[PDB]
Amino acid sequence: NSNICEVCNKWGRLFCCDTCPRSFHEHCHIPSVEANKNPWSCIFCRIKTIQERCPESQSGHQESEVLMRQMLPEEQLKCEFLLLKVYCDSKSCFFASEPYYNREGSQGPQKPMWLNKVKTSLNEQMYTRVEGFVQDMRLIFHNHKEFYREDKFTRLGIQVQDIFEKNFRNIFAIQETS
Ligand SMILES: [Zn+2]
Ligand SMILES: [Zn+2]
Ligand SMILES: [Zn+2]
């Protein structure tokens, strides 16, 4: 197994996947690494299993259809993985914890959002459809763009949103387009 966490790329107290060489800190994995379970399979392995059991699940889909899906176990897992893929980028640090807004010439967003809040929301099964999760994720970056205006810091939002959007298209097998 790897000797660094797959998400944050640091050593420490790591849990090792039994079906692939990845390792995780307890609260870096999403959901948090389970108490017992020997063997244990990580979320990357669990996602690959879904695909393997239903090869047709990788044919293209319309975003509009994906968003209206109910958060049954498999969609819950896909949203967990997509959230994890965002945390995998080191630039997610800017969006993890609760922000605050005091900048000359800007007003804070009406509805603040951050990755740890989305994490909690998923953990507490507060989303009923994929749309719920995707709207909150997109809101994070949209709030950032709006608040930072012409400061070049706005680009961190563009960057992290691109990681989100690419992973969304991949994980939910959105139909490729020009
Ligand atoms: Zn970690
Ligand atoms: Zn694994
Ligand atoms: Zn089948």
DSSP 60-87: -B-HHHHHT-B--HHHHHHHHHHHHHHH
Residues 69 and 51 in one domain: no
Residues 67 and 42 in one domain: no
Max CA-CA distance within the chain? 55
Q: How far is the CA of 158 from the centre of ligand 1 (A)?
A: 24
Q: Resolution (in Å) of the shown entry?
A: 1.9
Domain total in the chain: 2
Q: How far is the CA of 49 from the centre of ligand 3 (A)?
A: 12
Q: How far is the CA of 140 from the centre of ligand 1 (A)?
A: 22
Residues 156 and 81 in one domain: yes
Closest CA to 66 of 172, 163, 147: 172
* Residues 6+ positions from 82 with CB-CB distance below 8 Å: 133, 137, 164, 167, 168, 171, 172
* Domain, as residue range, for 83: 60-178
Residues 44 and 81 in one domain: no
